[PDB]
Symmetry: C2
Subunit: 217 residues, 2 copies
């Protein structure tokens, strides 16, 4: 069937895997692993980096027969598109594009933090800004079940990951935001997701992200 | 008319401004000015920010009728749809997406480099990798006039914003890639784009300057 690739960790691939599972898409996981050390032993990827035939060699990637997708957003939009899980009205499409880009920013903000040696320095800064970021998502989501109304589209999967991350990082921060917390329940509650949340196709070790300082002791 | 807002500088808004001009959309510029005092931090914009009624306030932003759009790629895609400058085929759908994200990443490359003082030492590193990413873009553009075949779409606007910006950094870069070097000429030769570039309202200020907090001397 189609194949998904990324490093052996949740990361950017987490939101994609979830979608592949929600849509029951038959896929294969060919995850590369990294040798954490001062010299960053990433050979695993390098030796097959160009052997794949992708236009822009990068992880994550997906190869659907003749289709070769690169970069999360492209991949997500692809499966979603081939499953009608997109936005219809100009309004839904606008929200859709704003969200995809908005969350991506948030992912990057936290990511840099969890990657910096001076974690302790920026950490307090991030915390005293996290609530204001969330407030915006709270208001937007409102009382609608999903970010695009009654329709659960791909942006929801992206949303779940970004929110779930900040929750694991600081559970107490999203306490003041009911609709957000309950949103995470709507997602995890989805029959197909819950079943997957507890299966072999998941990370044994409780670490959600590893890149340089985090994911290693 | 529409109300496009951003700091008086090229930035992300540059690719949008060109798209608007080309599509003959009567846009209204609301260009804010950055820090004048030593601590060149955001100022005037902050006094407005929330009062605009933006779901997620951030620059740039476009306000068309009842559509308050933020995030560069959201605005870009919005206008693309309205004027049919989007990918029609699934083959073109994956292409526009990959490229969309691929270019934003590349822009980030130069940006991050500019945002830091160590520039003088990091420059050679980035410079040494330039040919690599350009080989990919050239190979992708291949023989075809535009990145999505024979018809101009929005990616060509983000591509120009990235490629051209690179030529400004080091003119020699695209020399080894004639089709990209030619692409630039062709894009700049478009009736509307030409009219816009010769008209007193095109270039605000240089790229690195102000953004990289560099004061000319
Ligand atoms: N913008 C890309 C980012 C992809 C990326 O940075 N992937 C990293 C992991 S985070 C990777 O494994 N890089 C290997 C490489 O660049 O070759 C996306 O949307 O997927
Ligand atoms: N990722 C966002 C923001 C990009 C961003 O970093 N823009 C910088 C210039 S690079 C800037 O104008 N920031 C000021 C602001 O948005 O308030 C987008 O796509 O619009």
């Amino acid at each position: 069937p189609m194949t998904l690739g990324y490093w052996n960790i949740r990361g950017l691939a987490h939101s994609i895997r979830l979608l592949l599972e929600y849509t029951d898409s038959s896929y294969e996981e060919k995850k590369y692993t990294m040798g954490d050390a001062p010299d960053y032993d990433r050979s695993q990827w390098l030796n097959e980096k160009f052997k794949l035939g992708l236009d822009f060699p990068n992880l994550p990637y997906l190869i659907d027969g003749t289709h070769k997708i690169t970069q999360s957003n492209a991949i997500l939009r692809y499966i979603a598109r081939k499953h009608n899980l997109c936005g219809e009205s100009e309004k839904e499409q606008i929200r859709e594009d704003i969200l995809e880009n908005q969350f991506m920013d948030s992912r990057m903000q936290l990511a840099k933090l969890c990657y910096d040696p001076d974690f302790e320095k920026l950490k307090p800064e991030y915390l005293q800004a996290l609530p204001e970021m969330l407030k915006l998502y709270s208001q937007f989501l409102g009382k609608q079940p999903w970010f695009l109304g009654d329709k659960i589209t791909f942006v929801d999967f992206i949303a779940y990951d970004v929110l779930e991350r900040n929750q694991v990082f600081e559970p107490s921060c999203l306490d003041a935001f009911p609709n957000l917390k309950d949103f995470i329940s709507r997602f995890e509650g989805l029959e197909k997701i819950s079943a997957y949340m507890k299966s072999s196709r998941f990370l044994p070790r409780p670490v959600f992200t590893k890149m340089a300082v985090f994911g290693n002791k």
